[PDB]
Design an enzyme around this catalytic site. Structure first.
Site, PDB file in Angstrom:
ATOM      1  N   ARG A  19       0.885  -1.031   0.075  1.00 54.76           N
ATOM      2  CA  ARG A  19       0.255  -0.195  -0.301  1.00 54.76           C
ATOM      3  C   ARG A  19       1.064   0.978   0.165  1.00 54.76           C
ATOM      4  NH1 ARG A  19      -3.463  -0.059   4.663  1.00 54.76           N
ATOM      5  NH2 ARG A  19      -1.237  -1.247   5.891  1.00 54.76           N
ATOM      6  N   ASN A  37      -6.038  -2.410   1.490  1.00 58.46           N
ATOM      7  CA  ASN A  37      -6.264  -3.873   1.397  1.00 58.46           C
ATOM      8  C   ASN A  37      -7.794  -4.369   2.002  1.00 58.46           C
ATOM      9  OD1 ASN A  37      -4.035  -3.993   2.020  1.00 58.46           O
ATOM     10  ND2 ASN A  37      -3.457  -4.328   3.475  1.00 58.46           N
TER      11      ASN A  37
END
Length: 93
Positions: A19, A37
């Site tokens: 990320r 996520n």
């Protein structure tokens, strides 16, 4: 002009900085959006900006993201983001 895509990335993609590195490369490419996520072990990426800058992100994601990760599969939508700029059309599968 400005196109958007949504990509889902499967493999070893959580808890390996995926990320944070997407954020970094998305900024450098001057792109807007977010990464998140999901419960299924995958990461979603949403990205908008100029069509060539977006394609550089699709390439980075597909070429494996950060080095700590092992990308197995990338599903992006649409597969041809240029179809989004055409006055409203119909298409065949």
């Amino acid at each position: 002009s400005k196109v958007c895509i949504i990509a889902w990335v499967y493999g070893r993609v959580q808890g390996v900085g995926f990320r944070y590195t997407t954020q970094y490369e998305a900024k450098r490419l001057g792109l807007t959006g977010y990464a998140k996520n999901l419960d299924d072990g995958s990461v979603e990426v949403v990205a908008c900006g100029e069509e060539g800058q977006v394609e550089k992100l699709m390439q980075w994601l597909k070429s494996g993201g950060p080095r700590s990760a092992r990308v197995e599969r990338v599903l992006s939508e649409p597969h041809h983001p240029s179809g989004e700029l055409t006055d409203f059309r119909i298409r065949l599968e």
